[PDB]
Ligand binder design. Structure first.
Ligand SMILES: [Cu+2]
Ligand SMILES: [Cu+2]
Ligand SMILES: [Cu+2]
Ligand SMILES: [Cu+2]
Ligand SMILES: [Cu+2]
Lengths: 278, 73
């Protein structure tokens, strides 16, 4: 499995990815991913049990969630893998990502409804079923709620942080995990959700297929951080209430720990990942 | 400690909040909200964008909804 930058996909790969996503939607399987994400994001709290968000397991949790999704895509078309969106490089509404042959563009100004691409409500192929409001059509407002996507320099500043995470292991933490997640600092991952707008800005953000592309790049950044910091590793490492420690299992799967997900090469590689250097 | 309750009409919709940790409603339907460690708030319809108070979260929800009813969680 090689995870490729979306900007590099061939027309054939884009076709095959879109078709496999639409088949997971048609069969009912897609919406259960949406529901799982929403349950965790609504339950993960700074003061209580937290697994998928606002916590050190944010990264291994999304890694395994994306793996389940990619595995479902591969059950439809074994050639498909999750592409990633480098939002530091492909940062305008004119990126090819947002073209009609791939994810479609931004939402119209009246109601935010996406009008083009394979996931436009008008296709009849992308009903929004798992939702927090009556509207059942994909919505986006690219750049509407926040002006700019993170830059490479901003990403670099976060990649340079040596500690994986720090007590109190929540949205108030200093440390790489929380800066990448975005609750503190220049704000990388949360800001991208806000920038896309529409469902991507809500608990049911996997309703937008760009969800997977975003998290696949976040996941790549974790891998880049590890290469930058081969001497640094996941924390905490034992006896932390409400937080998934290194060798603790994670919900909902129960059969996997963060320890099992630190090395992504057991599951896939990237098109390019700089080796450790100085 | 608990924020104060509130009741107002915002952009033609009734928003209410009350300590429970804290509950928010839009036209009588509950809006799930969470308080962050630094005391800011988010809601299920704006989950990655902290705002200072539960009323701000309610108003951000009404802005996002553009008139649509909320679905009961
Ligand atoms: Cu709740
Ligand atoms: Cu998430
Ligand atoms: Cu900082
Ligand atoms: Cu996310
Ligand atoms: Cu070295």
């Amino acid at each position: 499995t090689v995870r490729k930058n979306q900007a590099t996909l061939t027309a054939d790969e884009k076709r095959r990815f879109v078709a496999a996503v639409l088949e997971l939607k048609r069969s009912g399987r897609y919406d259960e991913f949406v529901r799982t994400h929403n349950e965790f994001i609504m339950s993960d709290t700074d003061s209580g049990e937290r697994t998928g968000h606002r916590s050190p397991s944010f990264l291994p949790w999304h890694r395994r969630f994306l793996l389940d999704f990619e595995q479902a895509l591969q059950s439809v078309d074994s050639s498909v893998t999750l592409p990633y969106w480098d939002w530091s490089a492909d940062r305008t509404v004119r990126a090819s990502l947002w073209a009609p042959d791939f994810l479609g563009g931004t939402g119209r100004s009246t109601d935010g409804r996406v009008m083009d691409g394979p996931f436009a409500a008008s296709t009849g192929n992308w009903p929004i079923n798992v939702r927090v409001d009556s509207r059942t059509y994909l919505r986006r407002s690219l750049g509407g709620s926040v002006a700019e996507l993170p830059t490479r320099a901003e990403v670099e500043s976060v990649l340079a942080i040596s500690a994986y995470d720090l007590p109190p292991y929540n949205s108030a933490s200093e440390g790489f995990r929380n800066h990448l997640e975005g609750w503190r600092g220049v704000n990388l991952h949360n800001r991208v959700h806000v920038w896309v707008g529409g469902q991507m800005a809500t608990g049911v953000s996997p309703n937008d297929p760009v969800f997977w592309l975003h998290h696949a790049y976040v996941d790549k950044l974790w891998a880049e951080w590890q290469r930058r910091h081969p001497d640094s590793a996941y924390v905490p490492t034992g006896g932390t209430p409400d937080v998934v420690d290194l060798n603790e299992t994670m919900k909902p799967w129960n059969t996997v720990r963060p320890a099992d997900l630190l090395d992504h090469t057991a599951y896939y590689t990237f098109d390019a990942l700089e080796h450790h250097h100085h | 400690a608990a924020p104060e309750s509130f009741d107002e009409v915002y952009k033609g919709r009734r928003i209410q909040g009350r300590p429970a940790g804290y509950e928010v409603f839009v036209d009588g339907v509950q809006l799930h909200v969470l308080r962050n460690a630094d005391g800011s708030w988010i809601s299920v319809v704006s989950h990655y964008d902290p705002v200072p108070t539960p009323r701000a979260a309610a108003r951000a929800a009404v802005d996002e909804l553009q008139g649509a009813p909320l679905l009961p969680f």
